[PDB]
Amino acid sequence: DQFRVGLARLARGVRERMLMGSEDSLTPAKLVNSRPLEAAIREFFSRSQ
Amino acid sequence: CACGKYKRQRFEGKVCERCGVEVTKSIVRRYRMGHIELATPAAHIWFVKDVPSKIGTLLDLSATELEQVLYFSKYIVLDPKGAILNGVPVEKRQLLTDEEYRELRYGKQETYPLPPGVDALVKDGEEVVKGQELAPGVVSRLDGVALYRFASILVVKARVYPFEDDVEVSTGDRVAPGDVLADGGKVKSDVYGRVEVDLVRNVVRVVESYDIDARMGAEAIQQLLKELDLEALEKELLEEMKHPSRARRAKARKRLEVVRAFLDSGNRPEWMILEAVPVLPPDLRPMVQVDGGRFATSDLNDLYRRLINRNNRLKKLLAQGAPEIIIR
Amino acid sequence: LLIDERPEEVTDFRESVQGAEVIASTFDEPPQNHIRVAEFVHERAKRIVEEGGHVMILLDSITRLARANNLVTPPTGRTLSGGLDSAALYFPKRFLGAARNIRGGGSLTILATALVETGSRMDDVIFEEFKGTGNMELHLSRRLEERRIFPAIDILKSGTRREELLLGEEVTHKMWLLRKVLADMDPAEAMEMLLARLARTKNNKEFL
Amino acid sequence: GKAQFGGQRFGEMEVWALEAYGAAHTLQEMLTLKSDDIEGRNAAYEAII
RNA sequence: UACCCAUAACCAUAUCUCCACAUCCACCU
Ligand code: BEF
Numbered sequence: 001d002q003f004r005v006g007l008a009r010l011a012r013g014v015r016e017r018m019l020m021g022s023e024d025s026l027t028p029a030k031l032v033n034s035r036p037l038e039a040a041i042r043e044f045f046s047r048s049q
Numbered sequence: 050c051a052c053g054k055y056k057r058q059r060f061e062g063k064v065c066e067r068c069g070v071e072v073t074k075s076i077v078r079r080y081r082m083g084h085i086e087l088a089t090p091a092a093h094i095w096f097v098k099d100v101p102s103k104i105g106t107l108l109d110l111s112a113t114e115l116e117q118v119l120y121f122s123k124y125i126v127l128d129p130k131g132a133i134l135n136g137v138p139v140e141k142r143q144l145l146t147d148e149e150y151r152e153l154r155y156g157k158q159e160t161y162p163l164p165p166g167v168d169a170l171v172k173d174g175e176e177v178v179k180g181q182e183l184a185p186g187v188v189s190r191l192d193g194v195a196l197y198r199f200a201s202i203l204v205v206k207a208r209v210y211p212f213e214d215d216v217e218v219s220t221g222d223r224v225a226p227g228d229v230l231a232d233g234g235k236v237k238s239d240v241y242g243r244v245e246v247d248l249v250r251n252v253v254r255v256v257e258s259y260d261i262d263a264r265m266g267a268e269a270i271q272q273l274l275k276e277l278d279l280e281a282l283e284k285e286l287l288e289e290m291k292h293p294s295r296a297r298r299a300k301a302r303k304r305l306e307v308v309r310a311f312l313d314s315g316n317r318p319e320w321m322i323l324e325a326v327p328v329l330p331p332d333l334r335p336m337v338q339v340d341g342g343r344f345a346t347s348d349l350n351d352l353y354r355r356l357i358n359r360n361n362r363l364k365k366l367l368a369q370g371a372p373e374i375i376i377r
Numbered sequence: 378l379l380i381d382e383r384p385e386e387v388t389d390f391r392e393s394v395q396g397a398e399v400i401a402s403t404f405d406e407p408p409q410n411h412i413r414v415a416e417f418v419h420e421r422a423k424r425i426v427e428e429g430g431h432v433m434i435l436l437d438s439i440t441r442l443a444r445a446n447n448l449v450t451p452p453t454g455r456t457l458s459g460g461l462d463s464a465a466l467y468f469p470k471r472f473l474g475a476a477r478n479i480r481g482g483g484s485l486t487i488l489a490t491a492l493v494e495t496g497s498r499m500d501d502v503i504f505e506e507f508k509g510t511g512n513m514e515l516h517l518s519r520r521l522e523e524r525r526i527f528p529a530i531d532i533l534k535s536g537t538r539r540e541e542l543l544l545g546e547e548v549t550h551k552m553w554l555l556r557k558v559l560a561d562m563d564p565a566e567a568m569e570m571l572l573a574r575l576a577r578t579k580n581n582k583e584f585l
Numbered sequence: 586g587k588a589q590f591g592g593q594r595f596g597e598m599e600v601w602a603l604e605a606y607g608a609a610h611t612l613q614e615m616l617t618l619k620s621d622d623i624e625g626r627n628a629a630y631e632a633i634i
Numbered sequence: 635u636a637c638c639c640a641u642a643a644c645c646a647u648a649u650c651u652c653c654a655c656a657u658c659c660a661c662c663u
Pocket residue numbers: 508509510
């Protein structure tokens with residue numbers, strides 16, 4: 001569940017990144033950044049109850 | 050001190066040579082206090098949100114909605130003048146929405162752009178009713194006077210008066226009936242309202258909006274508390290308590306006890322709302338480094354910081370210009 | 378011009394002045410000789426400027442010159458607090474205020490060294506009297522000097538009059554801003570930071 | 586804590602019991618001399634030394 | 635005023651650093 005929450009965050013991020021993106025040959029870099037999902041998983045495994 | 054010239058026990062009290070600090074520990078920062086001079090008044094939250102609303106009981110104001118809506122939202126209260134009529138009788142402390150208020154403030158005004166180069170059938174001082182055909186296609190809405198420009202039409206529920214002599218009331222003044230408007234006793238005011246004189250057609254137009262109090266929020270409350278006198282209210286509550294039965298006298302005494310408490314305890318309710326906000330000594334809210342240069346801070350510091358930012362933004366905004374909605 | 382100094386310094390300056398006219402008057406000599414030479418220099422310089430000359434006079438120990446004058450000055454008349462003649466300074470005062478700027482060509486610029494904070498009333502009194510006569514002041518603190526930092530100028534107290542007259546509107550206004558900036562900066566720390574800042578470029582180059 | 590143990594909570598139930606007896610100065614010393622009065626505690630330490 | 639008369643300037647007094655809060659797990663009533 002925590003993974004899918006982080007994944008949805010990443011999905012919204014990539015939605016925005018496409019939204020202001022112009023060209024198309026940008027699949028790996030200009031679409032996905034690991035910060036949201038990684039931070040969510042780390043937070044769940046560290047500071048959860 | 051900052052420099053340390055006159056510091057020593059022979060001459061600690063002698064004012065410092067390059068400095069002005071009397072010898073003391075850090076305990077001054079435990080006790081010495083700051084303040085913030087807000088450009089706009091504000092009310093202590095306790096007196097407006099406590100279950101018996103001290104503001105809401107000292108004044109005839111509803112605590113749950115009226116007090117907050119005037120005090121936060123754009124609502125207007127007004128003491129002096131309410132005799133203007135909107136299908137509703139005179140007003141003394143009534144609460145009215147800023148829409149209908151702003152309406153009654155400057156008459157009953159409507160504007161209609163007119164095509165340039167087309168002389169509309171309506172002249173400068175033509176009375177217009179609803180349905181009257183102002184042009185091959187234009188129709189007004191209500192009984193009033195329509196003002197013509199080359200290229201615009203101005204429908205005002207005001208009264209026009211031609212005259213051929215000097216002006217007694219210039220442009221800007223707001224007049225009461227019977228007061229001389231122009232031409233001496235030949236023309237006199239008929240209703241409350243403001244006077245605008247146009248010499249192009251040599252005519253006085255009188256709107257139906259008299260000079261009435263317009264206030265929002267804490268300043269308004271201050272005005273109320275400034276104009277409130279405790280002794281007369283105390284006597285009035287006495288009579289309103291002694292005569293009737295128990296139900297009304299219950300709330301009568303519930304507010305009379307507060308009024309008596311104010312009157313007999315000294316401090317007048319004008320400063321019941323606060324203009325300058327005190328600032329706690331720094332050591333009571335210290336920013337202490339934890340590790341790696343990071344500073345743990347009491348939330349009081351954050352609250353003061355936010356308040357300072359808002360106050361400075363208000364000062365700058367009021368200094369530069371006044372977009373009314375933005376100012377509110 | 379040198380008064381009341383040590384002869385070895387006289388030799389040092391005289392050899393190291395590269396031909397510029399150094400006149401000296403050691404404390405060894407009777408002070409009457411000191412007054413004689415000083416006033417003869419005064420009159421000669423007055424004649425030279427009277428001939429439209431540009432004359433630079435570098436006077437030694439102007440407050441200690443006043444002390445030397447008081448040495449030459451017996452009576453004090455009514456004893457001022459400190460013991461100086463009513464007409465004593467009028468000779469130094471004429472000598473100093475004679476330095477001036479004329480529209481007719483030539484000039485007389487006199488710069489002199491003042492000994493102050495000497496613990497006695499005479500020097501402080503003379504410091505005050507000639508403070509209101511000079512058009513420019515340059516205080517040099519003991520604390521700056523003890524740290525072996527030279528020039529040990531007390532920057533804040535130092536200054537001139539009528540900058541715009543001597544300095545152009547661009548120049549005068551830009552140091553108007555410059556003083557508005559530097560007036561806050563602490564003296565010694567101003568020394569280091571402005572020293573670094575002006576080691577980058579020439580003064581005008583710094584403005585450039 | 587880490588450096589020194591810290592004192593003991595004296596709460597209110599202990600305060601209530603202490604004043605339930607006729608103890609008057611005991612509570613005064615334990616609330617001011619031994620706990621809070623900085624000048625008081627410094628003076629007390631110096632005096633007892 | 636100068637004999638009296640004129641004086642005001644330079645150094646030695648100490649309980650603190652962090653520990654705040656949140657979450658969680660335990661112990662004694
Ligand atoms: F003696 Be001041 F410069 F008037």
